[model samples]
Structure formats: structure tokens, C-alpha cells
Target: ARTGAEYIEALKTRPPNLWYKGEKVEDPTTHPVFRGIVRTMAALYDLQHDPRYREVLTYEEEGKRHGMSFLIPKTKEDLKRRGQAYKLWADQNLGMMGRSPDYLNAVVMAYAASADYFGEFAENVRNYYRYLRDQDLATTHALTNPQVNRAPDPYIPVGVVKQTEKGIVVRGARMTATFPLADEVLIFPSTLLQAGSEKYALAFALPTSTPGLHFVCREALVGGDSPFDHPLSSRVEEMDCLVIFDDVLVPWERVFILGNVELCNNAYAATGALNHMAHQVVALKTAKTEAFLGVAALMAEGIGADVYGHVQEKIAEIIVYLEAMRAFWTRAEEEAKENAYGLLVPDRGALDGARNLYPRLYPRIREILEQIGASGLITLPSEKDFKGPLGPFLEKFLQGAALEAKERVALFRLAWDMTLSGFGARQELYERFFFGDPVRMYQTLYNVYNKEPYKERIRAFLKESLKVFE
Candidate 1:
């Protein structure tokens, strides 16, 4: 596995075929817009080697070490260990870094675990997993095709674009790649690609530097000159990108699925990837809610609003949400079941149930942040103001009930960034559809969940009631 420093050094050399405001990025690791996130990713790599974190982060295999994300777990303890590893990373940015390295690693590990799901392409899947594990590569993904035209057949190259003697050539677009600055990208199916959608049925991995591929990244939202003004965003605004593959050549070795519609269709369901990866997100979400709870509680006290009945009620609401999220996290792991591939998948029902509620929960969480911070969120002082002549007077005037003026202002500023700033708003939107549209996700859950046993129990009760009447 690569050390964090080694990972940073590697990214410095990899071609960044990425575009920002207008021009192609010359050096992503050094560019202000991308450098912070690049540094954050590097830190995650470094965490694995820290004496305190080494045992928890890297599992031993054949006297060599590998990331916990790539470990194939046969026991419940292994899953718990993996969950802890994810939480340690997720807490770094309060769960806002959606494409933390482990998420993609989990995806590939699932592919490797369920290699047969790729049918004829099984070997490629296995090798791909090995490469990621051995290299300890950082990865993200672009799986959803762009919503260009909803017409029955708006055929573009996310269709076979063409097949060649050497490999498949693809031309199409996929949206929402979190962190295109990473080492490689796994292009897989996230939604149902119908039989006629053969061209878009492709799944593969490609280096970000692959020729003919362009990343049209969304605008960066981190706007603060210092951490004091935009704490969360300054350190971790994982930008989502629009991936355009224009006659991009994916050598046969890298192609895991080409024109295999069945595999594409059932990929998530068959591989147990969704549930496993959801565990990572679940850890992150848990941290997010916990952050909300702490911020709300602290802010209420900062303003002396804790004594108010209504304020107490809102603070308790945050506590409720935090506790509920934590419960789901615990249950998901505790009730995990082994899947067809013998991987101990986090409880699908528990994970999906939490996911179904997340979009709804996130908006409410943000609402609480907005209401709690209220007027405090406004008129925040810049770090520059803190060091200027006005600093002493403003410091004395701005103190909260218990906190120093600067401390109070700092807390509220973070609350503002986490809920109201452009970066904050973007995350709200990201969480809303994090797993795609809620309606589609709910529908899939409805179809896939086991409901028959509950229905049978209800029927038995109804039949008993009728017999008693009879």
C-alpha cells in the first residue's frame, strides 16, 4: 500500500485532464482550487501509517499491509474494524467528503468479491481489485449518464460509442464525479441501464490522464482565504465533475463490462456493493449528524438561548437525530448478513432505511442549524479583522454568554459555512440526491426488500380474529 506522502508525490506526476473556471488545470496539487482537497486526501493516506492508527487502518496480509477498505471480511469483527476505519476518515471533514478514498475501494473490493457478476470479464474484475489494493490507489467514480435528453433514444456514446479490435471505444458523458483529482476513476452503472442502453452499459476504470477524456468539473465552492471564515469548505469541498469520454480507448485489460447489460443491470444488487459502501456513507452521515448535534448545543449555550424552552426543544431534536443515526449505524453492522459472495454485507434493510430517510433528515438538520445560528450567523468577522486595530474593541463587544467574542464568532461562522454559504448549500443538494432520486431509491427498496413474512404474520392475525368471531 502506498504511504500518504507517496500518494501525494504520485498525484503530482499524474496528468490532470481536468478543467476549472476556464482553463485546463496545469498542476492540480498546487492549484488553489484543488490543492486543499488534494492535501486532505494525502492526509488520509498518511493516517494509515500513524502509530496510533496503523493497526486500525491496515490489515496484514502475507506479511504485507493493505488498507482496511480492500480487506475481504468473512467475520463480523472485520466489518466493525472497517467501519471504524471509515469513521476515522469521515470525521476528518465531518462526513462532507463523499468520495473519501475508501468509498471507491469498497466498490472495487465488492467487484472482486463478486467477480462472477462480470461473467466473461471476471478476471479483469479480479485484477482491477488487486491493482487498487497493491497500489493503494485513490479513486472516485462517474456512473450516472448526463440528463441531456429524456427522449426514448437520445443515443450518444454512453451507448457503445464503437467496438474496436484492440478494445472498446466510448463516447458519452457521466455526471457527479466527486474528486476527479484522484488517481483513477471507476466507471460503473449506478442506475438501471435498459437492454437498449447497450452503449451506456459499459463499466471500466481509467486513469484521469487517459487521452480523449475530459473532466468538466463543477465550480469550486471553497471561498475563504483562511479556515476561520469557511472552515469546512476551505479544507474539503470535494468537487463533482462532468466526465466526457470522446472516443476514449479503454484497453481490453481495463474493461470489466462491455455490452453486458445483465451485469450492468444487476451489478449493485448482486455484488452487495451498495450495502457495503453504504456503511462508509453511514459512518460519515453519523458524524455529520453528531456535528449538527454538538454545534446546535454549543450555539444555543453561546447565545444564552439554552435556557429558553423552545431552544432546548430544538437542541433535543438534534440529539434525537444524532442518536437515531447512530442506532442505524450500530444495527447495520450488528445485523449484517453474508451474501452470495460470502462477504459480510452490512444489513441492507438497515442501511437502506437510513438512506431513505437521509434526504429528509438532512434538510431538517440544516434547518435546525439555520434557526439555531440565526442572527449569530450574520456579521461574522474575518481573520484579518481579528488582527487589526479594531480587534480589541470588537473582541470585547462580541463575546457570547460563555465564550470569548472571537470564539463565539468562530463557532457561528462555521455554522454559517456548514449551512448557508454556497459550499453549505451545495452539500445540502448533494445529500438530497446523494444516492440518486429519493423516489427511485424508495421504489427499488420497495421491490427488493423482504416483505412477505410481515404480510404473512398480519394475515395470520386477521385469520385468528375471524376464527374468534366465528
Candidate 2:
């Protein structure tokens, strides 16, 4: 488990050409906008050292002296343990989302190890994938290109597919990458996006700082503030971006796939890869939001509103979401079947539905928190209130739980930070499109799972009695 400081130090050697806002960032570790996110990552590392969390969060590798965790499992059982770990971290945020490095690592590194079997098209994917693992690197993948125009063409965002000796010379850009600055950028075609747009059905991963790579950062929400003042707000960062490619040179070894339009959609559908991603993301949201609900319960408990119907309803609605998330996770995990590769893949259709549900549910989750938190969240004094003359006044007025007024006030502030602050808003938006765009997600959901048979079943009824069941 590398410390946040060590994470920064490791990153310094890479000097990633990460651009935040308009300027190329100078020092990400020390930057106001970058600090807290690194802190969160660092805390995850520190979890390895904590005796309580150590065994659960980490595992001993036979014959290996160094602990090289940070990789999520490819097995069904490991996914459960990993999900538990996800809850441990998500608990800290009340379910605000994050692209945990372990998940990304497994996807890239493991995928690379399997690339050779991808046939003639895998020449580049094999090498790129291997390089990524060898480096233990991170990446930000972009499937949607930058240009968006249609009408004359009908369905636009037609992917930028072109020919090359090494393979294809992919152009255009993609947006909403969850973590662009981490290390590498995955430039694969979306299975859903490829349904009618064959030209756009290309997949590859390019180092974010590659020669022709460019990034237009998705904005950040919060600035300088004490963790005491902004708790969760201080913790979230924008995991979104607009990654553009300008005629970047990709050699044969760097390309994992090309011209296999079928694989684009089939990969998600057949492999159940999206299922794991959905379970992980949705689970995180549910876990974190539950924490928020807990804080609100404490608030109501303190205010003698525990018996209030309206407050109870708010709490109950939150409970529904939490339970729904858990139910989905358990159902999908239990029902998982092994793929051709022997990886336990989640129920693709069910998990796909969950992925779609997360974004829609997230905004409502925020709304619930706001309704429960009320004015208390916005009115708290600054960190200085703890020391200045204002301290005593704040202390007397901010009471809740068994805690002093100051403690209650701090929790309210923390809750407010998650719902209303700059950084917090970013996480909200992040969750909205974390599993690719909504349009693409739903589009892909039906791409493979819903077949012509289902369509024909409906058509058969349309032509006659319309009473037959399939």
C-alpha cells in the first residue's frame, strides 16, 4: 500500500501531461483541486497498514515479498471480497463514486494477457496491454469521439475509423472518462455506439500523454476548504474529461482490436464485462448514500423528529435505494456464470439495468440528502469557528446526536459539502455517466441481449390476435 505521498512521488516520475482547465498542470499533488483526491487514494493505501482493514483489503501472495495488491479479482468469489472492500472505501464518501485503480488495472492487464487469443487483430492490443501491466500503470479510456453532428447524416457520432498499415488510424475524441489524469487512456469503441455506426466501431488504448493526445478537463466543483468545513466535498474530484486524438501514430503492437465490429457490442453482451462494472459502481453509490442517510437519521434523532412521518418517509426512501442496490449485487453475483475465459461474469442484462439505474437514482439521492440536511448544512461556520470568538456561539447552536453542537454542525457541513459544493457536484455528474453515456448504455443493453426473436414475437402479435406469450 503506497502512501498518497508515495503515489505522488511515483507520478512525478511520469510527469503526465495532464491539463486541468486551460493550463497544463504543474504539480498535481500539491494543487488545491488535486490534493484531496490524492488524499483519498492515499487513505486507501494506508488501509493496507491498518490492522483492522489490512487482512480484508489485502491478500498474501505466495512466494512474493512485496504486497502488489491494487488489482481487483477476475474470479467470482474474489469479486465479493472486492465488493466488500469497495464498501469500506465507499463508506467514507456516502457512496459518491470513484474509478478504483484495482478495477481498471484488472481490465487492462488481464485483457492484455488475453489479447493474443484475439487473433490477427490483436497485434497491437497485446503489446499495449503488456506494457500497461509491466508498468502497473493507470489509464482513462474514451469511446465517444469529440465531434457531434447529425441530421444530414441521420445518426451521427459515426466513429472516426480509417485505414493504416499498422492497423487503423483512429481520429475524433471521447468525453466523460472517469479518471483521465491517472495514467493511461483507453480508446476503445463502445459496443452500444457501434450498433448502426460501423465506422466508429474501433477499440484501442492510448497513453493520455501520448504525442497527439489532448484533454479538455471536466470542471472541478470545490476550491480550498478545511476537511472540517467541506468533509466529503473536499474528497471528490472530476473523473470526467474530453479526450481528443490528433492523428496519433499507433503501431501494430499497440492496437488490440480493429475492424471487428461484431466484438464491439458482443464484448459487452457476451462477456458480461459491463456487469461487473455496473455492480461495482452501483454498489458504491448505495453504500455511500446509506452513510448519508445514517447521518440524517442521527440529525432527526437529535431533533426529536424520529417520530415525524415526513422525516421517516425520507429515511425510508433512502432505505429502498440501499436495499435495491444490495439486492441487485447479490442477485447478479450469485447468478454469475463462467465465461469462455473462465472469469465469473455477472448477469449482463440485470447489471446493465442497474448501471442505467445508478445515474437516474443518483440525482434523487442527492435530492433526498438535501431535503433531510436542510438549512443546517448550508449555515455552518467556517473552520475558524472552532478557534475564534464565533466558536462558542457555533458550539452552542450546532448540537445533534450525543455529540456537542460543534460536532453536529461539522457533520451537517460534511453533508452539505457532498450535495452542494464544487467537488461534490462533480461526483454527482460523474455517477451520472460513470458507465459510459446513458444513451449508449441503454442502447448497448438491447444490442445483444434483445434479439430478433423478441422483435418478431411482438411483430407476430401485432399482425393478429396480439395475445400470444413468448
Candidate 3:
């Protein structure tokens, strides 16, 4: 696998076809809107080689090394080790980059291990997995179909419209590709494929710059905001884009699932990919919850409100959720099992439980932040205000009981960045459906969830009680 420097060099060579804010981005690595997040990813790659982080972030074999995320874990220790690696990266950015490279790495590993799930395309999946692992590639997946005024027994093709003897042709768009910086794009089915919708029943991967492929990014979030003003946005603004494949051609070798409705619909679950992918997500969610918990306490403490009975009660709620998330994720890691491919999969029930609960809890967490911070989130002075001519009066008036005016202002500013700002709002919505539609997700959980064991216990007890009633 390539080193950190080599990966950065490879990125520089790609120079993506990315558009944002009504203009083509000329240099993504240096663009004001993208640079911060780009650097964050670079640091992640470099961490794999940093002497102090090397042991935890990368696994070495015969003097060659690769990122820990790409490792196909076979034992509990291996799963725990990968969890540590995921936690390291997630904690560094407070889990803001949901589509981090490791997320796709886990998915690819699942596909690689269960190649037969793809039927005749098994060899293609196997080869691509080797390429991804060997190159330590950065990849992203786009599965959500485009939004349009149409019904879906057969939604008009926005992409993957037909198959040819040589390959498949895709024309249309997909929503929300979060990592514009990734090297390759994996297009897969996110919804159930109907019998007649074979044209849309497709899955494949291609280079980010493949001809006719384009990324029309949403408006940039971090524009011109100082670190003092938009702390979170300034450091971790991931780009979400609408991916357009204008008659893009996919070679047969790059295709994993095509014209197989049942297989395309079941690919993620049947291959155990969903369970493994959720493992990474649960770790990220745990770190994100911890951040929320800390921020809540810190904001209350900043204003001396932490000591109040009601205030402590509110912060305690966040504390409980944080602890529960940690327990759920750890339980998943502890109860890991080998799947059909003989690769360890963290417990899906626990991971999906975390997934089901996060959407409900995140908004509550944001509400708690808003409540505790209260007017302070809105009344804080800008960093420039501290140096202006009115500085003395403002300093004298704005000082808190335990914090200086500047210190209090900085803290509240961060609080705003975490709750009321555009960046924070986007985060709230993203987490709400990060695992897919909440209603659908819950239904799927109910359907596949193992209820027989619990149901049988109740059933046996009820039968015995009926005799007593008679």
C-alpha cells in the first residue's frame, strides 16, 4: 500500500471535475471552501504513518503496511483494533465527516469477502477489492436515487438506464455524494428494485474523473468564516454533491450487480455488509454523542448554570444517552461473529439499535444545547469586536462570573457553531436519515430482527397461565 505522501500525490494528479457555488473549483486542495476538510483527510492519511500513531492506524505485514480500515478482521481482537482505528479518526473530527474513506473501506471489504453474492460478477468484485486494498484508495458510494416528480414502479431513468453487450450505460443523477475528494465512486442500489425496474438494478465503481461523470456540489459551507466564528464549519465542512452520469460507460469488469433485482435489493444485507458498515457508523456516532455531551456540560458550566437542579437534570439526560451509545457499540464489538465469508461482523442488532436511536436523540441533544446556551448563543461578540475601540466597555460588561469577556465570547461562539449555525442545522438533518429513511429503517429492523426467542418465552408462559384461568 502507498504511504501518506504517495496518496497526497495521487490526489494532486486527479484534480477532480468538481463544481460549487456557480463556479468550477480550479484547485480543490486550496479552495477556501474545500481546503479545511481536504487537509483533515490528508492528516488522516498521514496519521497512518506517524510513528506515534503507526501502530494503531496501520497494520504491517512482512514490512509492508496498509491502513487498518482496509484490514479484513477475522477475530475479536482484530475487530477491536479496527474499532480503535475508527475511533481515532472519528474523534479527531468529532465524526463530522460521515463519508470518511474508512466508511467505504469497510463496505469494500465486505463485498470482497462475499464475492459470490454478486453471482457471475464475483471475480470483478474480488479484483476491485485487491486494487482498493493494495492502493489504499479513497472511495465513496452514491446509492440514493435522484429526486423527481415521478412514481417508482419504474421511475424514469436518471441513471443506469440500459445494458449492452460490452458494458452498461448510465444516464441520470444521484443525490448526496458526500466525498467529492474520493478517488472513485461506487454506484449501488439504495431502494428495493422492482421486477420491471431491471434497468435501474445496477451497481458499479468508476474513477471520479471518468468521462461524462460530474459533481455539482451544494453551496460551500465554510466560506470566509474565521476559526473564531465558525469553529466546526471552518475545520470539517464535507461537500455534498449531485452526481451526474451523462451516458457514462461501465466496463463489465467494474460491474458488481446488474439486471438482478433480488440480488441488488439484498446485496448489502445478504452479504453481511450492512452489519459491518454499521459497525463503523456506530463508532462514529458514539464519538459524535460524546462531543455533544461535552458541549452541553461546557456550555452550562460557562454560565454558572450547571449547579442548578434543573440544569444538572438536563445535562444528565445527555450524559445518559452518551453512556448508552458507548455501551451499545462496545456490546457490538464484544459479540462479534463470523459470517458466511468467515469474516467477523459486529452484532447488527446492537449497531442497528444505535442507528434507530440516534436520529431521535440527536435533535434532542441539539435542543438541549439550544436551551442551555439560550440567549448566549445569539449575544456573543465577534472576535473583531474584542480589538475594536469599544473593547474596554464590552470587556467590562460581557465578562462572566468565571470567564473573561474574550473567553466567554469564544465559548459561546463555538456553541453557536454547534447549534444555531447553518453547518449545525445541516448536521442535524444529515444524522436524521444517515442510515436511510427512519420509518423504513425501523420497519426493516422489525422484520429482520430475531424475535422468535423472546416471543417463544412469552408464548410458553401464556399457555400455562390459560390453564389456571380455565
lDDT of 1 by residue, 349-444 (tens): 888878888889899999988887887787888878888999998888889988998899889988988888999999899899978899898888
Against the unseen true structure, what C-alpha lDDT does each candidate score?
Answer: 0.84, 0.64, 0.82
Give candidate 1 regions above 4 Å deviation: 148-157, 464-470
lDDT of 2 at 88: 77
lDDT of 2 by residue, 153-235 (tens): 32234244466676455556665476554767766555354455666665666655677667666667555547787776566
- State the lDDT at 218 in candidate 3: 87
| lDDT of candidate 3 over 66-120, digit per residue (tens) | 7888888888899988889888889888777788888888888888888888888
CA deviation > 4 Å runs, candidate 2: 1-6, 49-51, 60-62, 65-75, 109-117, 121-135, 148-171, 191-200, 400-403, 436-470
lDDT of 1 at 158: 65
Model number with the top TM-score: 1
TM-score (C-alpha, index-matched) for candidate 1: 0.96
Candidate number with the higher TM-score (1 or 3):
1
Total residue pair clashes for candidate 3: 2
Pick by TM-score: 2 or 3, better one: 3
| Decreasing TM-score order of the candidates | 1, 3, 2
User: What lDDT score goes with residue 302 in model 2?
Assistant: 63
